[PDB]
Amino acid sequence: SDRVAQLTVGNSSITTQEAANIVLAYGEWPEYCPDTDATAVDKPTRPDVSVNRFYTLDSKMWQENSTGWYWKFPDVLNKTGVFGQNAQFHYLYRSGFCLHVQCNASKFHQGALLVAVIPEFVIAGRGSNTKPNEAPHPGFTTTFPGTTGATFHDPYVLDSGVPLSQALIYPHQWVNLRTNNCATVIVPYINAVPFDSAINHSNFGLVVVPVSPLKYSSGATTAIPITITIAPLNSEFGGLRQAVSQ
Amino acid sequence: SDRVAQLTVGNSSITTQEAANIVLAYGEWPEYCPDTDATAVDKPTRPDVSVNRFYTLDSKMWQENSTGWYWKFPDVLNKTGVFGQNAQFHYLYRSGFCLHVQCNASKFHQGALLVAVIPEFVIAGRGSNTKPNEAPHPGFTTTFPGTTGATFHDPYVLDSGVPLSQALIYPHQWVNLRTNNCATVIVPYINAVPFDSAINHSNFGLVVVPVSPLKYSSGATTAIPITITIAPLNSEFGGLRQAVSQ
């Protein structure tokens, strides 16, 4: 009863047998911006079914030595779908996301992944240089990896210089191969401003880090893909202009 | 709750752990013939517990290449039990059947059988001859195989020249080794006449056809028997005379 579940948004639907409940981040639902909180005076557009729906990205193959991956959400969807086209033609953006991570495996496999939504996730430079002018900075494509995602060098600090053990202070869910085959989290829109640009700013990141490694026996299936599905939810756009993708 | 179930009729009982619901053909229960529908004026006999009860037939061993089997119901039971003796001494017959098919297998086996009750199932001759006098006709023992049952030559057409894909238009149930270990269907008496002879006419056939073949791994149990159990239900007989078995 609680294990089984089905979502639906737009024309897309997801069904799960073995799922464990659902995480609603910070106890609030996504909403449209209220009149009091609004600032920009133009009438925002609310596409609904054309934008809000599940989008599936390419799959990551999880291997015994895998170090984990991450994504930036008002990034991955900027070049894909109708959501991506509204984002390039509009200067202002607001929405929440419903997030779903999926990893199958047999009852003979063992391991655990930590799925976490970590707002304002800022990757850092890796090096001992204390001089600000010569200090390393983490690339463009490492900061906004796009649809393909990026992988951690040293997941223990989350590339942020911050302990992964405390990452449970963020909306998070475990996917444990013996318990559940998927993790689901709904994130309301959070930021210091009512709207914000989609192409410049990344509200929050996602982190799938293999805490307990992947282990199995000879003869079992070796290839274990990981797939993420994200639904932009309760979207808004404003500030229409010509397309700027970068 | 829905998985587990137990039937009972007569002095016989069946219990199932993994069963999936029950099929009641054409949404009607077996009944005795009403006064309006009756024609023959003699008082029919209603043996009840001596006739109505579960009868188990010999088991079929299902092998990787198995092509399927079939039976004819007011046939298989004509030579067995007290039901068979009433059928030989009486000219008229009416009853419904409660039907149960049983195939065990491990969670490491895979395959699927299609159990179907197909009224007025008429096997056909196999050959290209268009001349009616030289055309082949399908034997006596192929038409009424008796308790031992008969096997299909080419199950894809069901020996009837009719596509098996459409066999789902008949009261039917799948037994899928990963889901359920047995299939159960109750069939009311159907025919164009209130009573009909048991030894001449076969109301309906049963078809167990291995759609997806049987597959397993070395070291697993090879022998996978299939057993069918049939309960003549709500029986009636009439037209008493000396025994005619053929």
Place this chain on the structure above:
Amino acid sequence: DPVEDIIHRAISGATNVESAADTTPSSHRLETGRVPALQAAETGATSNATDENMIETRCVINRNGVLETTINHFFSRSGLVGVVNLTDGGDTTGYATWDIDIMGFVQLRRKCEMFTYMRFNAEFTFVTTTKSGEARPYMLQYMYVPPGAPKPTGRDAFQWQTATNPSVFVKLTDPPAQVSVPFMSPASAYQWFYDGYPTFGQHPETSNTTYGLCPNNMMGTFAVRVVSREASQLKLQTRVYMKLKHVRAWVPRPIRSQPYLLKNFPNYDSSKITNSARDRSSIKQAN
């Protein structure tokens, strides 16, 4: 009361539906343990998943008519159940006889064989002409010969007096002849598949030709001549069409996949099995 044990519904019901079903507006659902998508095909019940549950739909009030699909409009169309060849000039001959079977050939046979039991009335129409298609002012006689009535043994036979057997006299240039027929079976329904034998006794495993035949479907014979004392020299062909009306149908079944080899028997040729489908290039490329 002296002994206790001697002291001792359905499922669904039919709804009258005049038009196709509508659609009601729905929205996204996110919650647990409510899943219209997951079904079990093993139970033998078809998926009850609807539109409104799977994705978001608008409010659609459907005016499309469902009427044309009733079985009573599906058989309202006439078809050719038999064609009989009459040559009055050849040798002696003089009459033609056609035993009534609507399985004679395909299109109408394939329709009626998707139900096991059918009860209905019928309407026969007789289109007669010359081998050349031309019409000539000759009078014809169509006599129906119920089971057990003596068949005509010649053009001059006394069988044609028809004090009982119903007849139709019509000239050949006139419009076709048309009659209504009731439901004449001795049973309560026609049945196109009978698994069993008409008689008791031994059933050889060499020639079973008795098998499959249902006597309740034998309606007798239809005979035709041309009325004169002297034998006319002409060739003639009579096509028989039948509407099928006031129809009821029971326990549907699949259509014929394979070409019909014989009239009374569902035989096919096992080497030629057609694999009803069209061949393709691998999978995962659609045309």
Place this chain on the structure above:
Amino acid sequence: DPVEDIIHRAISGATNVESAADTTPSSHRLETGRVPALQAA
């Protein structure tokens, strides 16, 4: 009304707590299907 589809909380709440929580006396329990210890992380 001309077209229908155009026709269209949180979870918890905050409690004012001035002092730390108290503790209430409990005793042994022996029965089935009541298990505060088993959790799902």
Place this chain on the structure above:
Amino acid sequence: TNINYYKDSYAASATRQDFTQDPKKFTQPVLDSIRELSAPL
């Protein structure tokens, strides 16, 4: 409002049309009602 010119009722026309459906007997011939929104097993 049809008409019959003979006293034998089987000679009549298509008579009156009708709309009747109970696909429930073919679609769902099961003895335990399956709620369409809930898990079958």
